[PDB]
Amino acid sequence: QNHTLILGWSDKLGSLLNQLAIANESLGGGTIAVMAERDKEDMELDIGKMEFDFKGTSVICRSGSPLILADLKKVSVSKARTIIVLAEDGNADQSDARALRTVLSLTGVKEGLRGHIVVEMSDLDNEVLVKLVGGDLVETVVAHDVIGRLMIQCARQPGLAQIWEDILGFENCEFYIKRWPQLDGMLFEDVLISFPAAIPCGIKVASYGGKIILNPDDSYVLQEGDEVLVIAEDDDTYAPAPLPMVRRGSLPKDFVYPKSPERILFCGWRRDMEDMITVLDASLAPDSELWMFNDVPEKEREKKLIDGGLDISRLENISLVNREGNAVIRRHLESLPLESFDSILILADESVEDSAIQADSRSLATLLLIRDIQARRLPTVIISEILDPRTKNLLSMSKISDYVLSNELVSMALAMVAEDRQINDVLEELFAEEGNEMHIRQADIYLREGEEMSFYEIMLRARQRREILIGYRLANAERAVINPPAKTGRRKWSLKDVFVVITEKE
Amino acid sequence: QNHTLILGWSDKLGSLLNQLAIANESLGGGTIAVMAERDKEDMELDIGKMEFDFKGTSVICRSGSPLILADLKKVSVSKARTIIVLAEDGNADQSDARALRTVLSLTGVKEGLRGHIVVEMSDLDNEVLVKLVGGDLVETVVAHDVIGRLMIQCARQPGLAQIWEDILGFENCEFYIKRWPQLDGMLFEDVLISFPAAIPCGIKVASYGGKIILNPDDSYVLQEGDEVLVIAEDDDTYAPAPLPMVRRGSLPKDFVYPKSPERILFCGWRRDMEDMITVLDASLAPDSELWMFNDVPEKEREKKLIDGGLDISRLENISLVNREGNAVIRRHLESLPLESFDSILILADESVEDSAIQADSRSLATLLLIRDIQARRLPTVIISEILDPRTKNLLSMSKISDYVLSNELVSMALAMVAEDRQINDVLEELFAEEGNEMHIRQADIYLREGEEMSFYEIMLRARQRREILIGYRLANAERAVINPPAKTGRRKWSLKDVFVVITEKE
Amino acid sequence: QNHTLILGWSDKLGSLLNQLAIANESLGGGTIAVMAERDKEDMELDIGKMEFDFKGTSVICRSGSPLILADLKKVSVSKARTIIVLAEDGNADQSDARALRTVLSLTGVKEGLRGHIVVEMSDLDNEVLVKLVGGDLVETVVAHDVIGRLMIQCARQPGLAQIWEDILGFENCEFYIKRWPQLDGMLFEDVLISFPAAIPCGIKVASYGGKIILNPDDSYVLQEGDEVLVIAEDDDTYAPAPLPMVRRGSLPKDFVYPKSPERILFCGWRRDMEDMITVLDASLAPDSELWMFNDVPEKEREKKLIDGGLDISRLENISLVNREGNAVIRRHLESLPLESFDSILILADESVEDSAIQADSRSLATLLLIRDIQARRLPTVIISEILDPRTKNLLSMSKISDYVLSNELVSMALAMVAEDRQINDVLEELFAEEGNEMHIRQADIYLREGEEMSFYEIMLRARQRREILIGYRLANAERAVINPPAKTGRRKWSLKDVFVVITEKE
Amino acid sequence: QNHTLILGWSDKLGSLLNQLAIANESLGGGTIAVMAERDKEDMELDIGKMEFDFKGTSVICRSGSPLILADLKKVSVSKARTIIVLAEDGNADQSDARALRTVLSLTGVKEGLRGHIVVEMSDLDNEVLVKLVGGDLVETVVAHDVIGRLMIQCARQPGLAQIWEDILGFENCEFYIKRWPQLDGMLFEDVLISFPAAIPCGIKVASYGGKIILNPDDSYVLQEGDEVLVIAEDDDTYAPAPLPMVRRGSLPKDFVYPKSPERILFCGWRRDMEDMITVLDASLAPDSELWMFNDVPEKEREKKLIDGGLDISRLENISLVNREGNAVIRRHLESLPLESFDSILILADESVEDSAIQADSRSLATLLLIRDIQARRLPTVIISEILDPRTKNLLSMSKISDYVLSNELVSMALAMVAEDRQINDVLEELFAEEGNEMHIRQADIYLREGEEMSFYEIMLRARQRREILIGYRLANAERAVINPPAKTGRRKWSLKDVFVVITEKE
Ligand SMILES: [Ca+2]
Ligand SMILES: [Ca+2]
Ligand SMILES: [Ca+2]
Ligand SMILES: [Ca+2]
Ligand SMILES: [Ca+2]
Ligand SMILES: [Ca+2]
Ligand SMILES: [Ca+2]
Ligand SMILES: [Ca+2]
Ligand SMILES: [Ca+2]
Ligand SMILES: [Ca+2]
Ligand SMILES: [Ca+2]
Ligand SMILES: [Ca+2]
Ligand SMILES: [K+]
Ligand SMILES: [K+]
Ligand SMILES: [K+]
Ligand SMILES: [K+]
Ligand SMILES: [Mg+2]
Ligand SMILES: [Mg+2]
Ligand SMILES: [Mg+2]
Ligand SMILES: [Mg+2]
Ligand code: NA
Ligand code: NA
Ligand code: NA
Ligand code: NA
């Protein structure tokens, strides 16, 4: 039957369904079963009111418990190509306790499973046990952790918020892995320029057990069994073609400039915030500063951080500045040097995160106050965490929408891992401090003002500094273009254009 | 379809429906749609039990969410002449979070809206964001704030409670704005005396963008496009007539007396009480005193007030006296100099206001205790905030009813703004410290004992001190008369009669 | 229609219905309507499972709100002979807030009411306001207060618990008031001995406005309009008969002995416990002691007592001894001088009384522990408050049942006041410190060992010390006999017999 | 009708039904009635989804209250052979309050009861009152207390966890009591070897009132009326046969070695944990140590222990070491000398035990952390309490399953006591510090390496040290064998085999 089975119901369900319908469109639609401990008629009424085009995919609703075999058989658990275990809204520990029981129940199905299980986890500290019992069947996506990592990357490089929104999920272009036997024996540097409608980003190496290698060496020779990872518009829109001849050349300014220290403000004590501090410390230049403004008394912060595993005496690049106050009170915020921050993250505070409507209400209040304080004393990059995807969609035609990053990104990640489990490893690397990550790079590294050249020609220059070029954003365009059309056509570039690459760090 | 759409359900719904039915009576009835996340049959049963005459208006109930387009279309959202977003009973922040999402949902309706949106807000600090996202579509009525402002005005001038109850809502007389081309070129001083059945209070000035000017200069010449604001019995009961000839004269005692300091007691720590203190400080004579009796420790009060934006070192007219205790405990209240207060406001305390039945129970207890303490030590104007309109109506044949001001006034304000959005600006000015407000004035300013004259004759005397005369209360009448009949008829007035005017301050 | 209407639903409803069915049996049954905000079919199912004989009374159930006129008319509110407003189980203030709204709703019925309203109040401090708004329509029965007063009387005189249980409610004998014109002109001393099947206890005096005078002077001459209060088996079982001739005589030991001091223990901090302390102080001999064992810190007790209106420096007869601890912890109870108490009251503590099952569980635990501590250190009168009548009935064949006084007594009081509102004044006096009360008296006051005489003969001796004799308990009988049969028959009495009288104090 | 009646619904119901179906299988099935205050159709749907073979037993569901006679008659309460009163999940005191009311209701059934009542109690301190009111009808099983006692025995002797799981409940072998007249006059030492398919463990002695004597003297002569207690596979699988001739001999190493001190860690403050400390102190060798790691401040622990009746100055064998911290925080656990503990019990903490899913989630976290801390610092017997039987079953194919003891054992105990009430006394003795208990004993006490002999021959050697031999575990077997087949067959034993006996202590 090879349908997608979703176990549970949450605020993320509608956007997850949408993503799966987009992914299935190239098939002419598929089948999604949703099983939840709710009345079947209510579920059907709610699905019937969703406002997105199902694109030929049909959704079936059943009432039942994922711990009850009789209920799992109502939805053909053992024939599904993927099973997605949705987190419950609310308390992260309760949700993760249910996730663990569900995974145990699924691993107990005696007929076995055809597909893999994608588990939406809410707290990183609960992941090890779920992975331990789920073995080779389970992929975990730790939603809270992912969102923190994305907020940091977008704080560091603002234009990335639009790029990540484009790449995640199934609108526009995303990652695909597929076997191309006619490419065996090719060097990766030729594979790179072999697909008119795609960009190769890495290789699934068969002699490594199927391990995905992002940004491999140009001299890697594809072996029998290897597959190519690409960015492409859909699973069936791209294929290799005879090699174009691409003019070669040199980089004009292949330099590394000393990265400048950054000053970042975290508003709110986010659950597990030490995990963000660790990521930040491994991402910023030395002598950077992290300001934490929140209502936890300073005396007690060190205890919270050390119990979550952070040694604040071994931080390498950031110093911590603590300030105490209420992020919705004007008078407390105005004592901050707001104008001095390179970026400000407004985080859902651990004391209210169990109610998305209350957390989101506070984050939006804080946003407005910060803007107004600054405006009123004037004779900045702000990112706000939003927990309910419906509130993000509701904001979409508001200016405020530029200042928000939502759990819709979690639904997009869940759908990608549901469609190909190995994409979890790709996104894990790109979200991690180690290994490859996305960067927006000035044009004067790659070309001189007005130089007439093709996307492929820039791509080969970018390989001299060990980057995979995936797109660009022209000087006065509002959106970057990922996986551009007509990669052999030439144009005159500007030093105000910028390029999007996959690269290792310094 | 041009019906009124009400989104939500609350303790105020019945009185709002009543007001809209009164407003619609002159049409022979209209249509009200009510959509709420409740069972349709329950809604219909509850509506069917309301005890007021629907006067030809028909009410339709639908079950649905205002965030769900499919549900908004069930009630013809885009054809309604007005949409009213009712606050949820309970916690003000939760209610305002829902109001914001609803406004975003409504502004997303792609067919657009024919009418405006009236949003019942529960907390002033949440208003800016709703106004920001609702743009030109939204009028906000901040219920909590309005009630505080009305309680202060009635504490300052007790007879105003009956006048405001009369003017608000659609029983008796209220404000109407309408275009009268045959009055172009007239001076406002002639317009004032041109309507046998109405009193002009201001002009919508077309050269100002449609801005409403209350109490304009007598020499203002009405221009093409201007409209007249009046107090009248209904939208269709009044029209201009040939000018009466009105005898002119002088004021006998056009004096200003030094306003005397007042001593006011606030019982309870009302949410956002600094907003009332600000209003009070701009309303009382110098060397006045505000006593605050409530259970918040004195040490901590200053912090609450400064965080809500009140600088208590810049108060101009009042000194603050703090007393700590429980307003339902006899022994604590009896240490207050109760007999010395010009007025006492019993306020719904922020610690219980999320339960109207609990708040109202405490306010009534405090009322009884204050009366009894004073009576028992005897060998005063009290105003009590009541949150459930049903409790006010239940009290109506009790003596206690003179001591109460309720959220029914909010339903009356919501209906007025629903019927003409520009009435929000009129009421905002009259509730504000700035600009015009209502005053009850002694007769010896305007006339001598037994002087025989008409209402219009007094009105023109009142214009010499830049007042609009809207009514009077005779010496032994229990009710003031607003917009009196037969304004040209003469009678003999008494120095114990009083007059109701719209005026600027000192 | 002259039915009983009960508004609400509670743990007391079944026992109230039972009492009304008993009261109605002599009519051949009546009608009770019950209206509650519950599903009608559930109500009917619950009524159908009650285990007591309805004795020809029919019960009708309707679903509705007592605040909604349409609902009050479903149950013929204006034709009922009585309306009983049942308290809600749980928090006393919430229940009393609902009682007040209900009374206002009932006083608003424009057709008026045929009968009176009996209001079950939960907190004495809320009674004044309900009485103020209910005027002449309302009788209040303050359940919590009544139970405290009964527990004290039974602690002082243990045999009274059985007597009060007999007299309250409609099993056995109770109070009736009725007009007997053929008795006009009789002296009260002859009226006393005029009813073979009843005992006159007082007169409703028409020249006093219908005021009930308990235990009037023997020389009072019944005037036209007066009615007689009696204890009798039912409203129709008694009538006056020609005067018997009763031998007169003297009292052998008409003495007053010095009342001995008592030591009483209160376990638990009962809500409003200062009201019990006041009653106790006016009831005990001088140099008595009240021990209060409970978890409130001693420092804070004085504040609680003074805020409830008790001045502990003006106590006349008792000294207060405070001990702090947990009444369910053996080790804390064993530090008390348990063997020294004349009586011990186990009270439902204010911290758990909102859950009757939790309060009753603690009171029974404490009971068991006190018994066991004493038994285990041995090489006492205990009274335990029980809040759910079902738990009292469940205990009935247990020995523990002698140690319990329950809210069933409240249902019995409510039914008595429902049947004749003037019985509220009778019970108020008998429960009050002032005026008449019930006493169990040794036989040697009235007679010598083996003296052969009739009940009437003892009754006339008792009048020489201004007592109304209502019954007796023979030397080895387990139950007292109230309103005995055959009052003229003689028997030989024992100095170990005891007599039950109504009397004023010392 | 002689069915089993179960009153209530809980997380234990499915496993209790399973056990009763196993017990009934030898009859061809029986009848179980389940009555709960739930909708009948929901109950039936849930029963219909249980995954275990009902083996011919039929289950009937009814909706009703055990306090309501009409409801008790729907399920033929007075004809049931047993009534089981299931605890409610959640708060132990609430559950026990309901148990007490139910027992009173059952003892009030005027037709009487045919069978006994088994009451699942949640707190030991509540047991006395239930036993007091239930008299001879009631058997109590205090679930919390039993589980603590089993965890201690399994900590002391790890192989016992598998043995107890085998013996409890009705899979494999369990206890049966039955009268065998043909054995009157036999010595108990011959009775011991008289049943090919059973092992006699004791005698119900008729001259003692039916008291069960475990491990009686070999010289006891069975008298008329006595019955034999055995371990056997089912009630009908065993019978006596002519005496086998068993070779006699001596024990080679009938020694007692000095028991070595043990170091035990308790993680979590379990409700009533003083009851476990008492058991532990009477079970361990002198100079043993009990470490308690939990979040209760050390200052306050002594108060908790003394109020629960533990005098820590009279402990005979253990010293207490207190450590404060959070058992789910790695950094706190790693300060413990984890490698030094003979066993570690992870206990459901009293602060979360009212939610089984939250308690079990913490216990599993702690388990994982302890393992990982030890593994990571390496250049142990752990027992974890699990409150929901479904979580134990879900863990069953996980390695983690060796580290868990669950409330399924309570369902097994309830079913055993339901089937024969006298088994409660047998298990009470075996769980108690006093009297007989189970022990795993080295082979070199009983035999020499390679000695060829039968199970009966070892059994008679074991009687010389006053042990009843019930089974063995061979050197490389994963499971012990209880009540072995073919007890007269010989084999060659190894010094690495071990024997399971019932014995008194030192
Ligand atoms: Ca696709
Ligand atoms: Ca965590
Ligand atoms: Ca795509
Ligand atoms: Ca109108
Ligand atoms: Ca506010
Ligand atoms: Ca009107
Ligand atoms: Ca009667
Ligand atoms: Ca009180
Ligand atoms: Ca009677
Ligand atoms: Ca069997
Ligand atoms: Ca306990
Ligand atoms: Ca078995
Ligand atoms: K994409
Ligand atoms: K009006
Ligand atoms: K009676
Ligand atoms: K077994
Ligand atoms: Mg962590
Ligand atoms: Mg403010
Ligand atoms: Mg009081
Ligand atoms: Mg104990
Ligand atoms: Na990376
Ligand atoms: Na104003
Ligand atoms: Na009295
Ligand atoms: Na034992």
Residue numbers in the entry:
A (entry chain A), B (entry chain A), C (entry chain A), D (entry chain A): 320 to 698, 727 to 853
From the paper:
Two DMI1 homologs, named POLLUX and CASTOR, were identified in L. japonicus and both of them are required to initiate symbiosis. We also determined the high-resolution crystal structure of the ligand-binding soluble domain of LjCASTOR and reveal that the entire soluble domain consists of two tandem RCK domains that assemble into a tetrameric gating ring where Ca2+ can bind and regulate the channel.
Other than one carboxylate oxygen atom from E493, which is also shared with the Ca(II) site, the rest of the Na+ ligands are all from backbone carbonyls of D485, G488, E490, and C492. The Na+ site is not Na+ specific as the structure determined by using crystals grown in the presence of KCl instead of NaCl demonstrated that K+ could also bind. Interestingly, K+ binding triggers some local structural changes, most notably the flip of the backbone carbonyl of L487, resulting in two additional oxygen ligands for K+ from the backbone carbonyls of I486 and L487. The K+ position is also slightly shifted from the Na+ site, resulting in longer ion–ligand distances in the range of 2.6–3.0 Å. It is intriguing to note that Na+ and K+ can modulate the open probability of the channel. With the same cytosolic [Ca2+], the channel has higher open probability in KCl than in NaCl. As this monovalent site is proximal to the Ca(II) site and also shares the same oxygen ligand from E493, we suspect that Na+ and K+ binding can exert a different competing effect on Ca2+ affinity and thereby have different modulation effect on Ca2+ activation.
